[PDB]
Amino acid sequence: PQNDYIERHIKQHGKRLDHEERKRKREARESHKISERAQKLTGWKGKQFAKKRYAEKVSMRKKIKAHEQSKVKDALPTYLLDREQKFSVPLPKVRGISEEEMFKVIKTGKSRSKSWKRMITKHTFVGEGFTRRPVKMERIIRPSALRQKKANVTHPELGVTVFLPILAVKKNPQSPMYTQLGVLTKGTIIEVNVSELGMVTAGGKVVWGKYAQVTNEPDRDGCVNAVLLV
């Protein structure tokens, strides 16, 4: 131990007498083994084998193309080189969300026959001073687990995307009563803290906030994605 003992043993004693023949025969048989596996594997193992074969073939083709290319043979400053980088909304006419969905009837009392309550089962922004009211007064319920604070906004320019706090919701289509509720409901326009991106308009009036539109459905995702409206 305490060293490359296997290497020293090989250099002093060598491999097995049939080791070379065994390795050569296994290498020769590898083609038949691959062919048999391509036809015998089942139970989703065939899917993985086919995917790996596809990846290997693509990699080999790309390597061959690169080798052939080798055999054939914007104006950044010195301190920035060798470094990494109509008024229509991007998503008009979003799918309409029914009023029956997103409002789960919640039943209360020993005899659950006076529900009178509604729960919003979609992500919503509830401001900074939310402070739930008494139980007897609250009708619409938005669980805290569904309350989002920071939204992922992608900059159309520079291809850079940053995680920024949500400021407010301005225009949610489909009965903007939901806008008042603050539901995201992909297709909504929300204010975002653009201060991080350092956008400055003419006149020295640095912009720390701007509009943005959510591009992903938060119902089926654990994150909020939006496209910055430059």
Partner: peptide, 29 residues
């Protein structure tokens, strides 16, 4: 953190597709 957050989000699932999407999102994360 990802597992805890996704479990909390999925505890409010309302449809089979929504729960499947949330589970797939957690696995992808």
């Amino acid at each position: 953190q990802v597992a805890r957050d996704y479990v909390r989000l999925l505890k409010f699932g309302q449809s089979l597709f929504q729960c499947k999407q949330l589970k797939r999102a957690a696995l992808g994360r």
